Symmetry: C2
Subunit: 80 residues, 2 copies
């Protein structure tokens, strides 16, 4: 087929390419950005959990120590 | 026509190069959306997990407050009086 025909669809075809390549650049950037921001939020939650998980074992410890001390007191009072 | 044969291969070249580009866009945004759901669901799980832990903390905090106050009350009675 014709060549004047060709350069015709050619200049167009370069355009469709030149837009897919751009959005290729976009969707890769997006994906990484969305990856980063989300794996950061997670490890931030997971840490508050172990923060909270171990704030809890310490309230438990405090409950046991409070009971230890105040029951020790009670006993010595009964034994005066 | 050898001309026809030449230009048809040239268009096939440009066509395929576009298709691979279009494929790449699709795979990437396919995998992006998939990973984004698996974690943000996992995120939700942790946010819930945190709600329950925060209830537990405020629960035990009150228990220890009540326990400290009646002990303090006992101690005070023996101090000065």
């Amino acid at each position: 087929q014709e060549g004047q025909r060709y350069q015709a669809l050619k200049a167009h075809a370069e355009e469709k390419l030149q837009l897919a390549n751009e959005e290729i650049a976009q969707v890769r950037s997006k994906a990484q950005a969305e990856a980063l921001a989300l794996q950061a939020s997670l490890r931030k939650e997971q840490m508050r959990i172990q923060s909270l998980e171990k704030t809890v074992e310490q309230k438990t410890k405090e409950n046991e120590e409070l009971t230890r001390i105040c029951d020790d007191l009670i006993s010595k009072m009964e034994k005066i």
